[PDB]
Ligand binder design. Sequence first.
Ligand SMILES: NC(=O)C1=CN([C@@H]2O[C@H](COP(=O)(O)OP(=O)(O)OC[C@H]3O[C@@H](n4cnc5c(N)ncnc54)[C@H](OP(=O)(O)O)[C@@H]3O)[C@@H](O)[C@H]2O)C=CC1
Ligand SMILES: COc1cc(Cc2cnc(N)nc2N)cc(OC)c1OC
Length: 157
Amino acid sequence: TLSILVAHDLQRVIGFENQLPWHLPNDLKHVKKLSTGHTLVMGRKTFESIGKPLPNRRNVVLTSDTSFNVEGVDVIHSIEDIYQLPGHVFIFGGQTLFEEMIDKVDDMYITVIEGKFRGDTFFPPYTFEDWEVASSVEGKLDEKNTIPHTFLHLIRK
Ligand SMILES: NC(=O)C1=CN([C@@H]2O[C@H](COP(=O)(O)OP(=O)(O)OC[C@H]3O[C@@H](n4cnc5c(N)ncnc54)[C@H](OP(=O)(O)O)[C@@H]3O)[C@@H](O)[C@H]2O)C=CC1
Ligand SMILES: COc1cc(Cc2cnc(N)nc2N)cc(OC)c1OC
């Protein structure tokens, strides 16, 4: 079972200067809830941004660097390694990985950030011609969570 897990804004921005462009604690809860007890696959830059492996799941980082051997983290050096990994695997980011995997995965858990941010990295265009909406849930707003956002589960038609 292979999934994409991603938050993108109205113009498919995912990233600025190796950080998330937005502060949205709710979305990272959304992320914790989905991925706890399974597997993330991420590119090296995304891991560096995060700076340590997420607790209570398997962290796998895809990189060319053969001297990568970080405690708590498993390394892979090819895309094709992903399909070996057992269980529910979430493609975690960033741009490069989403590009390489979007045609490959079963389904996508998307947070649409209902806003327009300055970005330097993007989720690739996609159509709902190709993707069925299994669920669409409004994120709830409050003092800490102030950008409107929608949780999509899409399944490849
Ligand atoms: N909104 C969201 O949900 C998310 C947003 N982001 C954002 O996206 C940005 C990061 O994305 P991006 O700039 O594309 O960098 P990535 O995090 O995708 O990392 C790219 C690196 O991953 C490794 N890699 C990727 N593909 C391969 C391959 N086929 N074989 C071997 N190694 C590979 C390489 O590492 P190396 O060069 O070491 O060989 C490459 O340089 C940041 O701004 C981040 O905040 C990230 C995740 C999620
Ligand atoms: C859990 O914390 C982070 C998570 C992510 C990846 C990510 C974040 N949100 C969503 N919806 N999908 C993802 N794949 C990316 C990050 O920085 C680039 C994080 O650091 C704050």
